[PDB]
């Protein structure tokens, strides 16, 4: 596309600059360009891709929630008729959000996942696939919602199976995957007990493996473990 004429290394360099400038739309466009060069991504590059799109979709999700809340209040009894504008604008934001999710899922399918053979890369991409289907699920309604939910579940499950076989219980990718899958269970799949069980077992198995880690790795793992703990406190 528009980044076809720019060197891979220049795209990565500019993605890092965009991050520093908090220009996340630009960062995402640069990283999309880098992916489309067709080479596999390094660990650092994978994280740049994730940071970029997470921030973009994050703003869209926050906006969608604001607009959805206003729309829901408009349909209460006693609320005055204000015309189609709230629905229209919520739909506009929703369509843009779905577009970003579709873009990410497209990159994963063409061809990041199929070329990812190492556990660290494959789990990372399958987790991302689950996350972006989860974001689609947040705004979906009806039967389409069922299929989207199943797609998220399937991606997370494949990632979980690999992570349990190939990574230690303290591995930050494994921990972040378990965290997000537990959120899926609680917030999307109407399965709070599964969410709680997953978070608890993940936390406890990580706790038992902390003794193997360096100071720096200990910091990395315990940061994510704290998020599991925070959710468990909210949920119980």
């Amino acid at each position: 596309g528009a980044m076809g004429s720019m060197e891979r290394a220049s795209l990565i360099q500019k993605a890092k600059l965009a991050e520093q400038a908090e220009r996340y739309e630009d960062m995402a466009a640069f990283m999309k360009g880098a992916v489309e060069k067709g080479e596999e991504l390094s660990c650092e590059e994978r994280n740049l891709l994730s940071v970029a799109y997470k921030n973009v979709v994050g703003g869209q999700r926050a906006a969608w929630r604001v607009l959805s809340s206003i729309e829901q209040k408009s349909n209460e009894e006693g609320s005055e008729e204000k015309g189609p504008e709230v629905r229209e604008y919520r739909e506009k934001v929703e369509t843009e959000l779905q577009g970003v999710c579709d873009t990410v899922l497209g990159l994963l399918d063409s061809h990041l996942i199929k070329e990812a053979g190492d556990a660290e890369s494959r789990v990372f991409y399958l987790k991302m696939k689950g996350d972006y289907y989860r974001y689609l699920a947040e705004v979906a309604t009806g039967d389409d919602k069922k299929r989207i939910i199943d797609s998220a579940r399937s991606a997370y499950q494949e990632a979980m199976d690999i992570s349990k076989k190939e990574m230690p219980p303290t591995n930050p990718i494994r921990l972040g995957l378990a965290l997000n899958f537990s959120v899926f269970h609680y917030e999307i799949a109407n399965s709070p007990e599964e969410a709680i069980s997953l978070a608890k077992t993940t936390f406890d198995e990580a706790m038992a493996d902390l003794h193997t880690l360096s100071e720096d790795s200990y910091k990395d793992s315990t940061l994510i473990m704290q998020l599991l703990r925070d959710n468990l406190t909210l949920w119980t």
Partner: peptide, 9 residues
């Protein structure tokens, strides 16, 4: 209050 997911770095 919403559940917290991970934050990329």
């Amino acid at each position: 209050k919403r559940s917290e997911s991970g934050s990329p770095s």
